[PDB]
Design a protein around this ligand. Structure first.
Ligand code: I6W
Ligand code: I77
Ligand code: A1ATB
Ligand code: A1ATB
Length: 9
């Protein structure tokens, strides 16, 4: 999940 969100940055 971290990756899925972190892609914003
Ligand atoms: C949420 O975005 C997310 C993405 C990817 C993973 C994840 C966990 C483990 C591996 C892996 O190859 O482990 C080898 C032991 C790959 N991707 N978790 C959460
Ligand atoms: N929000 N985006 C990021 O923080 C981000 C981190 C890392 C990367 C990225 C891109 C390309 C490579 C590579 N060619 O190995 C590695 N990491 N993009 C975005
Ligand atoms: C620039 C756009 C894609 C954005 C990225 C992160 C946070 C807010 C907007
Ligand atoms: C440089 C551009 C393609 C970008 C990369 C990662 C996150 C937001 C924009």
């Amino acid at each position: 999940l971290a990756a899925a969100l972190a892609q914003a940055l």
